[PDB]
Design an enzyme around this catalytic site. Structure first.
Site, PDB file in Angstrom:
ATOM      1  N   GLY D  30      34.714  46.598  18.660  1.00 27.18           N
ATOM      2  CA  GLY D  30      34.085  45.316  18.268  1.00 27.18           C
ATOM      3  C   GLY D  30      34.311  44.738  16.993  1.00 27.18           C
ATOM      4  O   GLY D  30      34.547  45.625  15.995  1.00 27.18           O
ATOM      5  N   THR D  31      34.154  43.481  16.827  1.00 28.98           N
ATOM      6  CA  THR D  31      33.823  42.674  15.521  1.00 28.98           C
ATOM      7  C   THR D  31      33.199  43.652  14.486  1.00 28.98           C
ATOM      8  O   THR D  31      32.525  44.339  14.502  1.00 28.98           O
ATOM      9  CB  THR D  31      33.012  41.546  15.864  1.00 28.98           C
ATOM     10  OG1 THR D  31      33.939  40.415  16.241  1.00 28.98           O
ATOM     11  CG2 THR D  31      32.134  41.156  14.637  1.00 28.98           C
ATOM     12  N   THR D  32      33.843  43.252  13.143  1.00 26.54           N
ATOM     13  CA  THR D  32      33.275  43.905  12.099  1.00 26.54           C
ATOM     14  C   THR D  32      31.893  43.497  11.413  1.00 26.54           C
ATOM     15  O   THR D  32      31.649  42.095  11.812  1.00 26.54           O
ATOM     16  CB  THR D  32      34.272  43.880  10.909  1.00 26.54           C
ATOM     17  OG1 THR D  32      35.501  44.307  11.240  1.00 26.54           O
ATOM     18  CG2 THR D  32      33.982  44.458   9.782  1.00 26.54           C
ATOM     19  N   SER D  75      27.650  45.170  16.248  1.00 27.02           N
ATOM     20  CA  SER D  75      28.945  44.831  16.735  1.00 27.02           C
ATOM     21  C   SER D  75      28.902  45.885  18.126  1.00 27.02           C
ATOM     22  O   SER D  75      28.512  47.117  18.007  1.00 27.02           O
ATOM     23  CB  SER D  75      29.890  45.524  15.530  1.00 27.02           C
ATOM     24  OG  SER D  75      29.594  44.687  14.466  1.00 27.02           O
TER      25      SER D  75
END
Lengths: 241, 249, 111, 244, 241, 242, 232, 196, 244
Positions: D30-32, D75
């Site tokens: 996932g996204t940071t 995240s």
């Protein structure tokens, strides 16, 4: 077939593999702790391993204050440690409300042992991967150490140790009591008892510690407290004669 | 929460065995030996107080438990399963007996009740059988002294003398050739002391051995006086000094 | 003791012409000898060409008007926007009302 | 044998719980997202991957507030984050109702921790597919916490999770050494905006939108607020400056 | 709260627990019923597994449901009992609430419904039973016969059979029942029933049971002798060839 | 193994899909919707000649303006029919009017997919999908005469004509040819008889197929054998002609 | 072959949830539908698919309140449940607060609704995709709902069979459809044009075309049959 | 008050039940039969609160009829009456007690004995030569205490009853519109076609 | 999920038989042998204790013969504990009947109830069946002396003579040879002992491996006596037949 391996039923050898693998988990943290009884105090030393420099080191602990009188040190992963911690606090306060006196160290061990026993018999509960060492200076019993494990066992100890180097630490201690021929550290002050406790930890792990490699709980008659690094430092210096 | 195991965990195999019960039974066999003997005027139950680390505390290890002031129990097998079973046992003696008839259950009845709890664990959804066998020794007024064995199946039987766990087959053979129906309590204690010796691998003293008697009434152990119709508990756990004292034989 | 009911006065009137219908009410709302409001209307348009007045205890009368308006909307949802016929509306109000047969709406209803 | 990785509750023969670790993979995919405990508050920031031009800018908000004084970012599986924050909200409401005081940050962490931990106790549930970074201000100061699917949580000087954690992590490590005095909230904001740009390289392929929030005693009066307008622009600008 | 779906579809569109229930039926002792012009007879077959069997206290194969309707089954015995209780209760409840006894069809439709529900409910298996339900409507002279399967399907039958070698008897039946000339007497009907049963059960007039339903609650079960005379008469009419 | 409500990798419900299989195994039922009314026919398909052909009930009345045809495991359809009857009547109790054919059908369909083993929300109490399908025929004043196919997927479609069960595609293809917007009702009858005779295992006669219609005037009637037998004859003569 | 897809409660060792991914696939099979918005309006256009030329075309547009409704691509009964639950929260909003429910808010409700069905045993995820339009206190709105519980606000989009044609169209004409304020008949033509990028290969009849409009001067209204002939 | 009388003679039990049904100010019916047949050889008469009486009676009838079919056995009068006695004793402590009084009259085909059982709404059951519920005892018990013989014929018992009804018809304020008389013997249950 | 660990104890085999019942019957085939024989003036129950040591208590022990009423006994073959659960239940049912009707429960009604319970365990609830077969001995005034058998399927039948447990084929064949309608209790007693003598999986039949009970009419016409034989009685009668 392959299912007596996954849930807490018996293997044909009469074993509960899930319990054993839970015991396996108690060591996952690679921490060692040990406990020891003074005349009127009870000490727990535990290692303190902070690896990431991004962590707040005040929040990294496996020692819990359960009640005013009862300390608990956990060997095992933190989320199970905290699950046991909350339940013991709940139980110790309930007990007080119903029975009008403080929940004794051993009674609470027995209670947590029975809770652990339940998970070894019901298929829908997993055991918790922890070992719980309870300490206090109990009003009827005196300095006390009681330990529970994922099998549901509960035992009192003159002294004890837990973690991956536990056999080394136990042998170490065994030898000292065998020599001194008493079931406790004959010392008036808890400071000199934590010092014995540190010494015998250093002399069996074959490591030295700074003030931030350790955790210390002391139990006195009506109080259990954890030491600051600043006071740990104080005993550490005193240790080096 | 969400206990979805409502189906049974002990089933019949095609051979007709109840696997989990056999396995539980097996876990008992590998347990430390304990034994019982019925004399004319008492019962003795005995077991080994096998300390793990010598840092552990001997007293803390109870394997012999008062259930009723006239009923004791001991076991072989998984100790936590036993501790739990003891507490259900004590509670049931009150709940289905003392609080209804105003007296403690006779020894066979308390036994059939422990048997009930155990049977359910071999049948109720989501559970495994208990991994213990118990010997239970008692005295009520209409049956006198008795000694029973209860297994993880829920079955139980009365014995003149028996043993369970590791050294059971040797112990049972030795017991068979020493038991007559005219032993005093004291004799049967001595025999129990003998039979334990063989099964106890190492040190054999009053702090490594546990012993109980179901015997005479101890009005010294009552705690109160003034009601002559109320005598002491018949159950008595022997002291290490008591065991050691007659170990000279 | 607590009394769950009250009386807010008001009178309403409904007349059926042979191709029209009127429903009228005063606009005064009272309590005992006090006037709460000179303008608080109690005759409502509930869509599908249906006007409705629930006169009596105002809380109940409000509650009932809300529930019915809402049952017109759900009827539409549930029946591909079929117009609610006046007779169907009436029968539906019976059920609304009778639902509280043992804790009634303290109102007299006209549509 | 094998198959220990099929049910959510099973200990594998090396005391592990594979379903939790597979959950961690959902997190890692996932996204940071990061957290920075400043000297009188905290700052939260997250990388909103812009899949397309059709995505309406500034909307699709991800950071969430709990009560009035706590910020949460996560995240992984976003619906799992939302679920967790709903629970956090009822758990904060319950605290305030009984006890009157808004819930202290460590107490709130334990509430989240015991809930997450609880989904690793039975095989009738799945573990949480998120790592959560949360915190804010109480009567004892600022607090930053990160919590994994295992229910494990600790307090952090700084924290990061998702695809670009190691960029952010090492990057955050720098400031810890460089400022033992701590940061301005004001300073931590801009400092956070840079780190999302840096840790963006592991997702450099796709376009992205930055989202920051902060909870600060001198700057927001103890309330978790979003950074928007001329201060957001300033910190975005500060991030572009340290690159090229 | 065991609610596991035991009766489910498999990819060919079959429900295997309902189908395995049919297998249980084929195994059970044969049962038959045939419609007279003004009666219905139920014929069953006595199990010849073992003797020393007490005949006066063993459950008969035909059960009265109300005083004008009988049920016979084929398949699991313990299963059939449950179905019989349920219908006997519905027979009473129906009379209590409508002041009429059940029609034969109503009661069939009731039993059918119960079985159907067991094919579609968590935690239960379908019934290993198939039933023949016979009698007359209240205040009606026309005979009724219905059969029921574990799937919950039911229908009416001029004559019909179920259980072991029912396939054989059905063949005999379709080649022996003139729908335009039903056995217009009790004798002609009881005879045709034995003829069908006997050619699967073998000589044993102790291996056969008969029950006769006439209009208005005239329901009578015959002794072996009445049956033995019926056996003997067709041995002869056959041994005239 | 796997859940009773799991998805195949193609995004289909196994149990639903397997139920459509049981349905194709069922006796044929056909509906055709004209402007003078709607007709429904079913193939009775009796197991043995000893079975009373009258006792086979595959066309049932739901309300006075709604009829039903079924195909599949017909025991499964009993409770659906009950719920449909209860629904049309309840609606009339609450609103003093006839329930719309659409809405009634929508209510039956709701009843499907209500299966599983503990789907967290309320109660999906039913071990398996229904293994039967319905042609629901009706009239109302808003949408005139109407025909519906109600599957165990809780989905329903309005057809102008539709066949289900053994040889639906066969029948459906034949329907796709013969159907036009200006069919008389008497035409649609002969048409159903034709298409049944093709796809029925047995030879067509009043004793092994049954016909019905729903007309605004008289509502829902099931034809008697003598009535149907006569329409068989009507078709036999019609068909002996170039 | 793979052992991690028998229920929704199981993570694969990659970190994936196959049961959710399978449901995702049910959508793509479902017939295309397109959503887009200006600042004064928001249009849904859906291609209803039939089964026979003897059949009808599945309604793909569902009205949720007077200011909000949705289009469905996928397993239909799940759009019933989901839309009906949306009618409820919309209703609750109005009854209890006299407040029209925020389009964003309905989006969060759907997400949390769908999530619950992906973490609990015995459940299945929803097998339906939804696009939601509405006009609330902050203008026109379009939302894309996925059964994983992912909801996004977008100026335009499409879901279903060959959804990618329309979606690509929309990505390029975005500077142009967002600037068409105060002219809905043309925001429909723009919506219909995008949906024609996903036809392979059929012509839009009056029977398969379904437009829905909602905006500043218009309550959510669904156009079908003759009413749509105008855009063919 | 409604009249509920019974007397068991040599080999038969006689039950007499008032025929009037009054709702407030009107006598709605004069042809009421306040009995249910439980078994072929067991009759139950009842009087009490308006709805409760028949609901209870029919409930008991259903249960006895169900038992009979389940076992192909006719339960004995003593057993039937123990069942009824328990059903009333349950209800007396329920949320709304059935307010029903009953006499049970049956011929025990097994013992060849007539038996008569009196039970009130609260579960008080007793076995008697003759019995009555309500005020009915107050007028007639002095008559029965006098003339009753354990060895009476049914004819004599019918005469004794005739006396009782006459005493009731002259001293009771209410018009109960006469009685229905029923006999339970070994041949079962019959109603006297004309009485008074 | 948990569905994996489910043995599915109530399903049909493809031949339409119930696994667990079939398997339970197998279990019972290994249990001590028990016999019921009905004479014109009584019923005899005889049974072989499966296990014996010399230390086992004879008088204090039960495992085969139990009172249900003062009129009904059972002989048990199988899982003792599973039998006591079923026995206690039966004992309560009989009292329920007595409280309701002030008559003793007819033997069959008691037997049917108990079979119905077993039957349930094979149709719902996902539990194992009881591993027990029952021989019933009793008197009522509707049918007089009765003898019944019931097994884990919930099926029951009536018998003149019958055996359960081990070696039933041998025992059934033996009783079938020597059983006569006009038999008296003293005869049936001997026939029972002798049938046990020839089916024992053991060397010689002694008193301390045997349990014995008889249901008589006695001296007083009307009353029925239940005699559950003492060890010394069993021993003495063993001598009076051609044994010991």
């Amino acid at each position: 077939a392959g299912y007596d391996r996954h849930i807490t039923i018996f293997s044909p050898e009469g074993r509960l593999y899930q319990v054993e693998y839970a015991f396996k988990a108690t060591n996952q943290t690679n921490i060692n702790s040990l406990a020891v009884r003074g005349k009127d105090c009870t000490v727990v030393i535990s290692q303190k391993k902070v690896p990431d420099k991004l962590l707040d080191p005040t929040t990294v602990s496996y020692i819990f204050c359960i009640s005013r009188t009862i300390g608990m040190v956990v060997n095992g992963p933190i989320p199970d440690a905290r699950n046991a911690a909350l339940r013991a606090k709940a139980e110790a306060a309930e007990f007080r409300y119903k029975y009008g006196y403080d929940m004794p160290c051993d009674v609470l061990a027995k209670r947590m042992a029975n809770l652990s026993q339940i998970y070894t018999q019901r298929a829908y509960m997993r055991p918790l991967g922890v070992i719980l060492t309870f300490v206090s200076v109990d009003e009827e019993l005196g300095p006390s150490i009681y330990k529970t494990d994922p099998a549901g066992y509960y035992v009192g100890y003159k002294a004890t140790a837990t973690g991956p180097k536990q056999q080394e630490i136990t042998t170490n201690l065994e030898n000292h009591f065998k020599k001194s021929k008493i079931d406790h550290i004959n010392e008036e002050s808890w400071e000199k008892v934590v010092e014995f406790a540190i010494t015998h930890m250093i002399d069996a792990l074959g490591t030295e510690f700074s003030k931030n490699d350790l955790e210390v709980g002391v139990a006195t008659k009506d109080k259990f407290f954890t030491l600051s690094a600043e006071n740990i430092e104080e005993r550490l210096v005193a240790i080096a004669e | 929460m969400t206990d979805r195991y409502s189906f049974s965990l002990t089933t019949f195999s095609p051979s007709g065995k109840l696997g989990q019960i056999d396995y539980a039974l097996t876990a008992v066999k590998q347990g430390v030996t304990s034994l019982g003997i019925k004399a004319t005027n008492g019962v003795v139950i005995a077991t080994e107080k096998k300390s793990s680390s010598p840092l552990a505390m001997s007293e803390t290890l109870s394997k012999v438990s008062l259930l009723t002031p006239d009923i004791g129990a001991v076991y072989s097998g998984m100790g936590p399963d036993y501790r739990v079973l003891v507490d259900k046992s004590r509670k049931v003696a009150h709940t289905s007996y003392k609080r209804i008839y105003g007296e403690y259950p006779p020894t066979k009845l308390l036994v059939s009740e422990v048997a009930k709890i155990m049977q359910e664990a071999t049948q109720s959804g989501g559970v495994r059988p208990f991994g213990v066998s118990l010997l239970i020794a008692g005295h009520d007024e209409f049956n006198g002294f008795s000694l029973y064995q209860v297994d993880p199946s829920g079955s139980y039987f009365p014995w003149k003398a028996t043993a369970i766990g590791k050294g059971s087959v040797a112990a049972k053979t030795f017991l068979e050739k020493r038991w007559n129906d005219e032993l005093e309590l004291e004799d049967a204690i001595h025999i129990a002391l003998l039979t334990l010796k063989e099964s106890v691998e190492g040190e054999f003293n009053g702090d490594t051995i546990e012993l109980a008697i179901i015997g005479d009434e101890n009005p010294d152990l009552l705690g109160y006086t003034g009601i002559p119709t109320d005598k002491g508990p018949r159950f008595r756990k022997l002291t290490s000094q008591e065991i050691n004292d007659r170990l000279e034989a | 003791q607590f009394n769950p009911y009250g009386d807010n006065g008001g009178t309403i009137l409904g007349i059926a012409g042979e191709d029209f219908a009127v429903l009228a009410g005063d606009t005064r709302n009272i309590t005992d000898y006090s006037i709460n409001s000179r303008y608080e209307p109690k005759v409502f348009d509930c869509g599908d060409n249906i006007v409705m007045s629930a006169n009596g205890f105002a809380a109940d009368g409000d509650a009932l008007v809300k529930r019915f308006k809402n049952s017109v909307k759900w009827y539409h949802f549930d029946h591909n926007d079929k117009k609610l016929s006046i007779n169907s509306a009436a029968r539906n109000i019976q059920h609304l009302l009778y639902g509280k047969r043992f804790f009634p709406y303290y109102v007299h209803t006209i549509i | 044998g094998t198959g220990y990785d099929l049910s959510n509750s099973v200990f594998s023969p090396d005391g592990r719980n594979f379903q939790v670790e597979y959950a961690v993979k959902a997190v890692e995919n996932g996204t940071t997202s990061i957290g920075i405990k400043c000297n009188d508050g905290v700052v939260f920031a997250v990388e909103k991957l812009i899949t397309s031009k059709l995505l309406v800018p500034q909307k699709n908000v991800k950071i969430q507030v709990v009560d009035r004084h706590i910020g949460c970012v996560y995240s992984g599986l976003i619906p799992d984050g939302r679920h967790l924050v709903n629970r956090g909200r009822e758990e904060a409401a319950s605290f305030k109702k009984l006890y009157k005081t808004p819930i202290p940050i460590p107490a709130f962490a334990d509430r989240l921790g015991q809930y997450v931990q609880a989904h690793t106790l039975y095989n009738s549930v799945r573990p949480f597919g998120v790592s959560t970074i949360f915190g804010g201000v109480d009567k004892n100061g600022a607090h930053l916490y990160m919590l994994e699917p295992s229910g494990s949580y600790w307090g952090y000087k700084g924290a990061a999770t998702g695809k670009g954690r190691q960029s952010a992590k090492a990057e955050l490590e720098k400031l810890v050494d460089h400022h033992p005095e701590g940061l301005s909230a004001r300073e931590a904001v801009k400092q956070a905006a840079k780190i999302i740009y840096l840790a963006h390289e592991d997702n450099k392929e796709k376009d992205f939108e930055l989202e920051i929030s902060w909870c600060s005693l001198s700057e927001t009066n103890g309330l978790h607020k979003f950074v928007k307008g001329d201060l957001l622009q300033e910190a975005i600008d500060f991030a572009q400056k340290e690159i090229n | 709260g065991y609610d596991r779906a035991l009766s489910i579809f498999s990819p060919d569109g079959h429900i295997f627990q309902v189908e395995y229930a049919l297998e249980a039926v084929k195994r059970g002792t044969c049962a038959v019923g045939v419609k007279g012009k003004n009666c219905v007879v139920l014929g069953c077959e006595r199990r010849s597994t073992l003797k020393l069997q007490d005949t006066r206290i063993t459950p008969s194969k035909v059960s009265k449901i109300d005083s004008h309707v009988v049920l016979s089954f084929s398949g699991l015995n313990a299963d059939s009992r449950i179905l019989i209780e349920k219908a006997r209760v519905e027979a009473q409840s129906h009379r209590l609430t409508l002041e009429d006894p059940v029609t034969v069809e109503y009661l069939t439709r009731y039993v059918a419904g119960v079985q159907q529900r067991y094919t579609q409910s968590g935690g239960v298996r379908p019934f290993g039973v198939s039933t023949l339900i016979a009698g007359f409507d209240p205040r009606d002279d026309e005979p009724k016969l219905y059969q029921t399967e574990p799937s919950g399907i039911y229908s009416s039958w001029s004559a019909q059979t179920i259980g072991r070698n029912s396939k054989t008897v059905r063949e005999f039946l379709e080649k022996n029942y003139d729908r335009k000339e039903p056995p217009a007497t009790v004798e002609e009907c009881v005879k045709l029933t034995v003829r069908s049963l006997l050619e699967v059960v073998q000589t044993g007039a102790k291996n056969i049971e008969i029950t006769v339903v006439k209009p208005d609650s005239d329901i009578v079960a015959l002794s072996s002798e009445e049956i033995n005379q019926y056996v003997t008469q067709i041995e002869q009419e056959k041994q005239e060839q | 193994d796997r859940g009773v409500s799991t998805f195949s990798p193609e995004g289909r419900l196994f149990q639903v899909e397997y139920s459509l299989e049981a349905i194709k195994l069922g006796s044929t039922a056909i509906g055709i919707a004209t402007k003078e009314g709607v007709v429904l026919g079913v193939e009775k398909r009796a197991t043995s000649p000893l079975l009373e052909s009258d006792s086979i009930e595959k066309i049932v009345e739901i309300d006075r303006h709604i009829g039903c045809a079924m195909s599949g495991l017909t025991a499964d359809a009993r409770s659906m029919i009950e719920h449909a009857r209860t629904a049309a009547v309840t609606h009339n109790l609450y609103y003093d009017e006839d329930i719309n054919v659409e809405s009634l059908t929508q209510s039956v369909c709701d009843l499907a997919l209500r299966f599983g083993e503990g789907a967290s929300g309320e109660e999906r109490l039913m071990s398996r999908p229904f293994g039967v399908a319905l042609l629901i025929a009706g009239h109302d004043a808003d949408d005139g005469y109407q025909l519906f196919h109600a599957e165990p997927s809780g989905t329903f479609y309005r057809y102008n004509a539709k066949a289900i069960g053994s040889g639906s595609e066969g029948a459906q293809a034949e329907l796709l040819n013969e159907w036009h917007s200006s069919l008389t009702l008497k035409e649609a009858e002969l048409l159903v008889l034709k298409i049944l005779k093709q796809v029925m295992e047995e030879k067509l006669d009043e004793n092994n197929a049954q016909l019905s219609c729903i007309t605004k005037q008289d509502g829902f009637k099931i034809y008697d054998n003598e009535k149907t037998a006569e329409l068989i004859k009507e078709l036999k003569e019609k068909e002996a002609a170039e | 072959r793979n052992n991690y897809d028998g229920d929704t409660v199981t993570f694969s060792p990659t970190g994936r949830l196959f049961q959710v991914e399978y449901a995702l696939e049910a959508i793509k099979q479902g017939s295309v539908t397109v959503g887009l918005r200006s600042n004064t309006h928001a249009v849904l256009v859906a291609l209803k698919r039939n089964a026979d030329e003897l059949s009808s075309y599945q309604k793909k547009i569902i009205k949720c309140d007077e200011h909000m409704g949705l289009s469905l691509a996928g397993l239909a009964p799940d759009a019933r449940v989901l839309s009906n639950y949306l009618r409820q929260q919309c209703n609750y909003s109005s009854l209890v607060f006299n407040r029209k429910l925020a389009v964003e808010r309905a989006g969060h409700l759907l997400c949390d609704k769908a999530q619950k069905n992906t973490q609990s045993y015995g459940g299945r995820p929803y097998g339906v995709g939804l696009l939601i339009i509405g006009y609330d206190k902050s203008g026109a709105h379009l939302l894309e709902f996925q059964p994983s519980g992912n909801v996004t606000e977008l100026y335009g989009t499409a879901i279903g069979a060959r959804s990618q044609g329309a979606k690509t169209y929309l990505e390029r004409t975005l500077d142009t459809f967002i600037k068409i304020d105060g002219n809905p008949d043309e925001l429909i033509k723009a919506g219909v044009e995008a949906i024609s990028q996903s036809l392979r290969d059929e012509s839009l009849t009056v029977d398969n075309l379904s437009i829905a409009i909602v905006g500043k001067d218009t309550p959510f209204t669904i156009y079908d049959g003759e009413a749509v002939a105008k855009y063919i | 008050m409604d009249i509920i009388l019974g007397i068991r003679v040599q080999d038969s039990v006689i039950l007499a039940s008032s025929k009037a049904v009054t709702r407030g100010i009107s006598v709605l019916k004069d042809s009421d039969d306040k009995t249910r047949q439980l078994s072929p050889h067991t009759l139950m008469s009842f009087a009490g609160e308006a709805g409760d009486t028949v609901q209870f009676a029919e409930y008991i009838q259903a249960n006895i009829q169900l038992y009979s079919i389940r076992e192909d056995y006719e339960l004995s009068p003593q057993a039937v009456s123990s069942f009824v006695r328990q059903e009333l004793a349950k209800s007396i402590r329920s949320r709304r007690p059935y307010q029903v009084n009953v006499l049970i009259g049956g011929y025990d085909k097994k013992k060849n004995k007539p038996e008569l059982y009196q039970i009130d709404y609260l579960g008080t059951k007793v076995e008697l030569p003759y019995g009555a519920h309500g005020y009915s005892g107050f007028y007639t018990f002095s008559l029965l205490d006098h003339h009753y013989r354990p060895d009476m014929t049914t004819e004599e018992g019918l005469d004794l009853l005739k006396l009782c009804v006459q005493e009731l018809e002259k001293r009771m304020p209410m018009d109960f519109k006469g009685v229905i008389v029923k006999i339970v013997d070994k041949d079962g249950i019959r109603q006297v076609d004309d009485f008074q | 999920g948990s569905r994996r660990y489910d043995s599915r104890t109530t399903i049909f085999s493809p031949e339409g038989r119930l696994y667990q019942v079939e398997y339970a019957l197998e279990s019972i085939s290994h249990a001590g042998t028990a016999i019921g024989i009905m004479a014109s003036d009584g019923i005899v129950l005889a049974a072989e204790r499966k296990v014996t040591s010399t230390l086992l208590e004879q008088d204090t022990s039960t495992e085969k013969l139990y009172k249900l009423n003062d009129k009904i006994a059972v002989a048990v073959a199988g899982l003792t504990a599973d039998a006591e659960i079923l026995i206690n239940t039966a004992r309560i049912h009989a009292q329920n009947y007595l409280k309701t009707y002030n008559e003793d429960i007819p033997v069959e009604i008691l037997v049917r109830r108990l079979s119905d319970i077993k039957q349930g365990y094979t149709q719902h609830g996902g539990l194992r069946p009881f591993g027990v077969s029952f021989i019933y001995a009793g008197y009522d005034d509707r049918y007089g002396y009765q003898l019944y058998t019931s097994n884990p399927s919930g099926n029951y039948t009536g018998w003149k003579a019958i055996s359960v447990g081990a070696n039933t084929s041998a025992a059934q064949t033996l009783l079938q040879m020597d059983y006569k309608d006009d038999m008296k209790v003293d005869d049936a007693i001997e026939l029972a002992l002798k049938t046990l003598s020839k089916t024992t999986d053991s060397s010689a039949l002694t008193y301390d491996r045997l349990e014995f009970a008889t249901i008589r009419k006695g001296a007083n016409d009307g009353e029925v006596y239940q005699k559950i034989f003492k060890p010394q009685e069993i021993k003495d009668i063993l001598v009076k037949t051609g044994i010991t």
